[PDB]
Amino acid sequence: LSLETQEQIRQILSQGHKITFEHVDARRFRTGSWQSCGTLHIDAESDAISTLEACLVDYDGEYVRMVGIDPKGKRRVVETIIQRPN
Amino acid sequence: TYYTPDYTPKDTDILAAFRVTPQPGVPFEEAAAAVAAESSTGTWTTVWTDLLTDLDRYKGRCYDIEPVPGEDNQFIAYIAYPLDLFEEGSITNVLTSIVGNVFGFKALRALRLEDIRFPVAYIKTFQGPPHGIQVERDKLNKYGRPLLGCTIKPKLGLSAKNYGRAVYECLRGGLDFTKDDENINSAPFQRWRDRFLFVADAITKAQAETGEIKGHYLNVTAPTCEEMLKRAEYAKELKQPIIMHDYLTAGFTANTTLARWCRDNGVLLHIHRAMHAVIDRQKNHGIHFRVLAKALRLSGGDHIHTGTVRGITMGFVDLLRENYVEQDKSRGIYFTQDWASLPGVMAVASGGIHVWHMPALVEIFGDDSVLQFGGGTLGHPWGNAPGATANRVALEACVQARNEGRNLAREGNDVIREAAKWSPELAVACELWKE
Amino acid sequence: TYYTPDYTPKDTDILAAFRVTPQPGVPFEEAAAAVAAESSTGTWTTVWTDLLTDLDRYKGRCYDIEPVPGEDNQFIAYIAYPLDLFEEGSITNVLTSIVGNVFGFKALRALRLEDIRFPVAYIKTFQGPPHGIQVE
Amino acid sequence: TYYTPDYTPKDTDILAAFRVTPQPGVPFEEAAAAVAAESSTGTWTTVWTDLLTDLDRYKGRCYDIEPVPGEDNQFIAYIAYPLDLFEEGSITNVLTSIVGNVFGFKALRALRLEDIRFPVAYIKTFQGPPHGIQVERDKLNKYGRPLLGCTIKPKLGLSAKNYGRAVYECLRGGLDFTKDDENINSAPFQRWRDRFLFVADAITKAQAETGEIKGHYLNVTAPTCEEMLKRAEYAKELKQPIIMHDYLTAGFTANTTLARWCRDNGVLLHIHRAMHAVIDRQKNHGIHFRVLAKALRLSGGDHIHTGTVRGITMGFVDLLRENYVEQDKSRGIYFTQDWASLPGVMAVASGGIHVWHMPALVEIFGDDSVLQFGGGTLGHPWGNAPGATANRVALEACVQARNEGRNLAREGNDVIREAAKWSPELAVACELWKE
Amino acid sequence: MQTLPKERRYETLSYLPPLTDVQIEKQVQYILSQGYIPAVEFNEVSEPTELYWTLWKLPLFGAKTSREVLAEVQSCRSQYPGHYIRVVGFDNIKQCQILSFIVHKP
Amino acid sequence: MQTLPKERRYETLSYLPPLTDVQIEKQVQYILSQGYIPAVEFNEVSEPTELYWTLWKLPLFGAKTSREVLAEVQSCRSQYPGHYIRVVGFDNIKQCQILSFIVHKP
């Protein structure tokens, strides 16, 4: 949980957008095939930092990334990779 | 494993809006997962061959359910289809994959496709319109004003020569265009090749007379694809600026090889919307016209019939002309569509209008549209030539009044009656078609 | 009017990385605006015909300058080109519009194209490989 | 066994001049024998198959080494290649055999081809130019004077019709030609077929006006070889005297099938030198432009871009026009080239010139050249038609002064100013582009 | 009943009686109000086949009032009495002419 | 600003004011000085499509001075007043015309 991570968390949730975090192991990253982990459409900072530390640990040695989702139709606004495999 | 609400649509993805009426005792989740499945990689049973291919990547899935206000067992379904699974530059496949046999499902009584969004990546594969609006005005040298067309009546009966003369008197008065009816093909009474030769003599005659560029839509629609191309070889040969086709009845594949040919040769194509009223009529069942209008713009077409007037009709008119259109649920538009520099298609207004509907149709449709009078020109007391000058002077009066800065909703009946004072031909027509 | 740093690149846009070596006495801003101009709708003088077409929409522009570490008068230029102005399914045009005659410019001694990004929308027009690895 | 200094070159032999920069610790003999070997029947090891074929007869060999004055590990290498081993009437092979992979050799840091001599026997196999200078002047009926071209600006933005009008006003004033930009192909905003139709209307218009033969170079450069020929089928169909191509970018084989087609049909071809600056820029690395200019003359081409000014530029200008040219090391020419009655290619001067560079360019390039104003005609205070009449009167003034017997180096500023007195159009342009 | 007489017509606003110099001023006021660029064009003969007329000076890019376009009209009318002249309006966003009507006949 | 008037132009040296008989003598002096063969051509009508005019007598192969070409010019002007007349210069090494300019209009 870096300073870049929580500002983007705060920038996403300051837009009224919902956060989704997604992981991927190195093999399926080739084909850009990520999946949801924890609770989707997150609308507050503390739910974001709690399931971020849940997913950093649950899928350590995988990629993990945070999604900013506009709840209007569920449109993907901003994508950023937080964790990369070792 | 088909109903997944948490999913967030990508930009390179085709999205669809279905109005669903399930059978009673059927939940809102299962009937939504069934049309999302049955359109793309869907089977009634689990088969072993699904474990070799990656089903997660290709599958269409329902991400949002919205219940329709004031309606029981009626709700809107939003399904997202990955981009890869459709073939490139073909309406035939997108039509076939989605709205194939999800209709006539036992789980549901009534089903209606409302709208369809195209990602920009998919939009690029097509040719689209062979010319467009901007291109079309430049070939004909006509600016400022809506363009005026004419449908020859009666529909079937006249000889090839009588057709040739009834077209001559109309463009002489001052119509831009004349038009063949949607059911005239190669009828025994007038063969196509004879009709094509006499119409050629009457355009050159009225061209050297009035001193303007005139045209006539030569219906090309033919049973086979050889005949269609071979008839068109002859229209190019007589130096005809325009021909026309019915796209729904001939099929999308027939309409496709034509448009490629038409861009190859630089002939403008008119499209009649024959047989539209059987699909898009019912508000519970069918496909909405706006879906078919997009499909036309993409197939290609310089003109298209939109139908005469309201909140719904201006929805799919601004959708065919504008480069960028915004989501508006009251207008009837469900998705944000973005066209990648693709030229616009000109609106065609035809079906039972006279010289008193003239103020109403210039304001609503605007400047980039064609106004077509079937019964309004021929049925003039004085004949075809005075009936044409009647409709010409009445358009030019409303276009001058609009520029100076007059509201044509308020002073609409006022501008027609001032013009009726110095021109004899409009005085006898104002009399006949009253209020 | 060619150098605009505030610009944020769109997704349907082709982006290019140039390694630039200017002639001494040439600022870092003018030599970057000159290769961004001379590749797409660029002319040495103001002409009257530019007031009939919409120049703002079509023009390629430099949005980011990065100085090369341990190198004097050497920096990386980032220019963005709208998607519309290239013809569809032809390498010949993309090669022609960008790296045409921006090379052999008097304002600069040496020039090197490092990389080129293709938006997905543009990639779809091509056939690409007749088969590929899996097929082969 | 590759370095043989005693060797005296034959007449039926292709000779090459390389500027070599070896890696330090590499002798002057081994790096010269390595580029003489690796271009033709060269391998890093002794193989057994070399004892069945006669290696002595086919092998290219270095016969002369000249050290470059005032340069360390920099010397000129002279290699001779027997005539037999190249295929007949193909630039593709000669380019492939010599300058294939001798570049990027580990033994040497930098390498530059300076010049290339063609024996007369090899020159005869090619078509060369489809017409040439003498032929070209005869089809256009223009004598005495350099010919005047114009580049439409901006490069990408204008519609097919706006392009059609911007070309009409320029040839009306009194330009010989108009030209398409090197990156306009089949852009979405204006399709080629629309651009090809509107330019046809504006040439016939200004032809019947001024009473002279006018032209416009229609850029034909296309991604595939079907499209290229098919676009050209259309230019012949609208009776166009000229089209144009970029030879480097499309490749030599594309440019070849075209030139054969062009001689077949009697259309004059302009060649733009797009993407030249990346190879011929560096004085230590690449191939010199004079090699590529030769390669063009042989491939075929009626016009060629030479670039604006000096001792070097007149070297390869007199090399493309003259039938016989002599060895001059100061000019930059290493070998005696002799053309076998092959017609000459006309010089095209384009890139940032105004009405004050007018005296300098008629004297240096002479009479048989094309002067092209991109920014100099459109950017006139009064528009395109006066801006054309400005450059026309300024050329005809310098051509008349030259004939009577005035030096245009001393009295160059003088003739431009005494012409500015009786014509209003040159007085406002003399004002604007000053010194 | 009446038979329609043979008349040579001139594109937009030719079926209405020949325009007064006040009706001229209102139609160019509409050009400058929408933000389009008004310009003057002249030609010797009027035919359906030719689509490029000879341009009068430059398109007036700096046009504040409709009177400056009227003064350019009368100076061309004075220079060429035996020419056809028309005023057009270029748009810069859609790259197309909005209006094209004929003011003076030879 | 000024609009460019419509003029029918006549190949080389037509945008310069009509040539004086001294300016004629200097340009033919240049033909004989370079060693080219000066000749006189006439035609009834001037058009961009036709590329052969009716030749006057022969190319004057034996021409020492520029006055003998001027006397051939005046005798044709006298014979055909209502003809276009131009003087050309054949070269014998490069097989091409160097100069082509029109002296008398009908």
XYZ file of N, CA and C in Angstrom, chain D residues 157-159 161-162 164-165 168-169 172 198 201-202 205 381-383, chain E residues 41-43 49-55 57-58 86 90 95-97:
102
model
N -6.539 17.725 -44.699
C -7.639 18.474 -44.057
C -8.789 18.775 -45.007
N -8.484 19.246 -46.223
C -9.484 19.751 -47.205
C -10.360 18.599 -47.711
N -11.628 18.896 -48.011
C -12.592 17.978 -48.675
C -12.228 17.853 -50.159
N -13.950 18.481 -52.791
C -14.476 19.645 -53.557
C -13.605 20.880 -53.294
N -13.235 21.118 -52.029
C -12.399 22.271 -51.589
C -11.017 22.171 -52.243
N -10.585 20.630 -55.146
C -10.947 20.878 -56.556
C -10.953 22.356 -56.911
N -11.342 23.223 -55.968
C -11.453 24.694 -56.174
C -10.094 25.361 -55.926
N -8.180 24.923 -58.957
C -8.772 25.686 -60.091
C -8.177 27.101 -60.150
N -8.093 27.790 -59.005
C -7.670 29.216 -58.904
C -6.184 29.370 -59.260
N -5.431 28.915 -63.143
C -6.167 30.039 -63.775
C -5.242 31.255 -63.911
N -13.124 15.622 -59.108
C -13.286 17.091 -58.931
C -12.129 17.840 -59.596
N -12.712 18.288 -63.303
C -13.668 19.374 -63.651
C -12.933 20.720 -63.704
N -11.943 20.923 -62.827
C -11.217 22.203 -62.645
C -10.144 22.386 -63.728
N -11.882 23.312 -67.060
C -12.419 24.681 -66.833
C -11.345 25.724 -67.171
N -0.961 37.779 -50.293
C -1.969 38.625 -49.648
C -3.354 38.635 -50.316
N -3.404 38.394 -51.632
C -4.583 38.636 -52.507
C -5.249 37.320 -52.933
N -4.616 36.175 -52.658
C -5.177 34.834 -52.914
C -4.297 34.014 -53.839
N -18.225 35.532 -55.852
C -17.810 34.723 -57.028
C -18.463 35.302 -58.283
N -17.728 35.339 -59.397
C -18.230 35.803 -60.715
C -17.838 34.796 -61.799
N -18.674 34.705 -62.834
C -18.452 33.860 -64.034
C -19.100 34.553 -65.235
N -23.063 22.221 -66.035
C -21.902 21.293 -66.127
C -20.698 21.859 -65.356
N -20.416 23.166 -65.456
C -19.241 23.800 -64.788
C -19.599 24.101 -63.325
N -18.680 23.788 -62.403
C -18.896 23.841 -60.928
C -17.824 24.696 -60.237
N -16.968 25.394 -60.994
C -16.006 26.393 -60.455
C -16.133 27.708 -61.229
N -16.554 28.752 -60.509
C -16.617 30.165 -60.963
C -15.309 30.862 -60.571
N -15.005 32.010 -61.186
C -13.794 32.818 -60.880
C -14.024 33.563 -59.561
N -13.135 33.364 -58.583
C -13.263 33.935 -57.217
C -12.897 35.422 -57.252
N -11.452 38.494 -55.385
C -10.495 38.818 -54.290
C -10.270 37.563 -53.434
N -10.410 37.693 -52.110
C -10.317 36.596 -51.113
C -11.660 36.466 -50.402
N -22.386 35.650 -57.895
C -23.117 35.023 -56.763
C -22.263 35.111 -55.497
N -18.785 29.814 -46.855
C -17.968 28.653 -46.418
C -18.138 28.448 -44.910
N -16.671 21.670 -43.425
C -15.963 21.716 -44.740
C -16.995 21.536 -45.863
N -17.863 22.535 -46.050
C -18.953 22.549 -47.064
C -19.579 23.947 -47.142
N -20.111 24.311 -48.313
C -20.858 25.578 -48.540
C -22.294 25.403 -48.035
